[PDB]
Amino acid sequence: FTRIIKAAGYSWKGLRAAWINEAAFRQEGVAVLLAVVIACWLDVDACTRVLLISSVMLVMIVELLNSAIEAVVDRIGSEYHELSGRAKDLGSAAVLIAIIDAVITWCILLWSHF
Amino acid sequence: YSWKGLRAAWINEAAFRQEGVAVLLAVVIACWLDVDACTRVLLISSVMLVMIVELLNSAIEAVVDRIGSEYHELSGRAKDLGSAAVLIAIIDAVITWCILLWSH
Amino acid sequence: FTRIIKAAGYSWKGLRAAWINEAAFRQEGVAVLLAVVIACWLDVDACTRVLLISSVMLVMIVELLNSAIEAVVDRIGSEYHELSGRAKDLGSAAVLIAIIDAVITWCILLWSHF
Ligand SMILES: Nc1ncnc2c1ncn2[C@@H]1O[C@H](COP(=O)(O)OP(=O)(O)CP(=O)(O)O)[C@@H](O)[C@H]1O
Numbered sequence: 001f002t003r004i005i006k007a008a009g010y011s012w013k014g015l016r017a018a019w020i021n022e023a024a025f026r027q028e029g030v031a032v033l034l035a036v037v038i039a040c041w042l043d044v045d046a047c048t049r050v051l052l053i054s055s056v057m058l059v060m061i062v063e064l065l066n067s068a069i070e071a072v073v074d075r076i077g078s079e080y081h082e083l084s085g086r087a088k089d090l091g092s093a094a095v096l097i098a099i100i101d102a103v104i105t106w107c108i109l110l111w112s113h114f
Numbered sequence: 115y116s117w118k119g120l121r122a123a124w125i126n127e128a129a130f131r132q133e134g135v136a137v138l139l140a141v142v143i144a145c146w147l148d149v150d151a152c153t154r155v156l157l158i159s160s161v162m163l164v165m166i167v168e169l170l171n172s173a174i175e176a177v178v179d180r181i182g183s184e185y186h187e188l189s190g191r192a193k194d195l196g197s198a199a200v201l202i203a204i205i206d207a208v209i210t211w212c213i214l215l216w217s218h
Numbered sequence: 219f220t221r222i223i224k225a226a227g228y229s230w231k232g233l234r235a236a237w238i239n240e241a242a243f244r245q246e247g248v249a250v251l252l253a254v255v256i257a258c259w260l261d262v263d264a265c266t267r268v269l270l271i272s273s274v275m276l277v278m279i280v281e282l283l284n285s286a287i288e289a290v291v292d293r294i295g296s297e298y299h300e301l302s303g304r305a306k307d308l309g310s311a312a313v314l315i316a317i318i319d320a321v322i323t324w325c326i327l328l329w330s331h332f
Pocket residue numbers: 007010126127128175178182183184185186187189190191193194197
């Protein structure tokens with residue numbers, strides 16, 4: 001039961017680390033937090049409201065996992081000299097697909113609002 | 115691969131079992147409630163997302179442990195970043211269930 | 219705007235790599251355009267059309283993050299000469315749950331529409 005408070009602190013510590021270190025996290029988080037607020041104040045149904053929010057929050061989840069992968073690569077880079085960067089490319093690709101998805105979700109749903 | 119990973123996640127990780135139960139409860143409750151298709155999908159997939167992220171989080175932790183059990187700044191950062199992603203998935207899941215059930 | 223062009227180039231470098239390296243991604247890539255076409259060809263509402271696409275997109279995202287983890291393990295595997303499959307299994311386990319989710323989504327939604 002106390003493992004929750006322990007894991008909560010780690011999560012909060014990871015959020016700060018993401019925010020402090022990753023620049024892509026800060027900019028995306030801004031556009032994400034903006035989108036979340038708008039979705040909370042639109043004239044739409046629950047299914048649409050959720051779809052707008054979740055597609056946007058997915059960008060943050062992927063970006064957080066991308067940063068974790070990059071931190072792993074950096075850990076390797078401190079002990080090893082050659083870095084292909086292939087792992088960071090795949091992580092950057094994953095964030096792109098998540099963003100494109102969020103763009104599509106919003107365009108499609110708002111085209112019903114119109 | 116796939117099943118070997120699900121078997122290892124269920125046996126060793128405890129939070130994964132609390133999501134596995136939650137997934138079944140999600141599916142059960144989503145089907146027992148008189149809701150539309152999109153709502154039922156949203157209740158299920160939002161919970162399964164938490165599991166998906168949890169699996170990826172555990173995978174990242176495994177790599178870190180393999181690099182070494184040695185305490186480094188980037189080793190703990192990677193684990194905290196992974197742990198943070200699982201949080202957002204849960205937050206997303208909680209928000210999802212709220213909006214859908216509030217409208218009921 | 220200079221960072222964006224570089225980040226996108228990384229993402230494209232990551233996608234171009236995933237397409238050539240893994241055949242699983244090629245399959246999922248085909249499925250996406252197929253899902254988009256099927257979602258648009260069918261006369262369905264916006265909420266469902268989004269879920270039909272987002273579910274398949276999620277698989278491609280999880281695959282990319284998995285391939286990123288697989289790449290890190292290989293960089294390590296070359297240095298350590300060890301092959302512990304904890305990471306690779308958990309990564310593929312994640313993709314499995316994603317695919318299962320995509321099937322449930324397509325079932326529940328299309329079962330309702332027809
Ligand atoms: N090698 C390391 N270097 C630095 N910090 C580390 C570390 N290993 C663990 N930590 C720190 O301790 C915390 C707990 O480690 P870890 O996140 O792997 O536990 P966990 O709660 O996920 C247990 P389980 O593997 O059963 O799920 C991490 O979030 C991190 O803050």
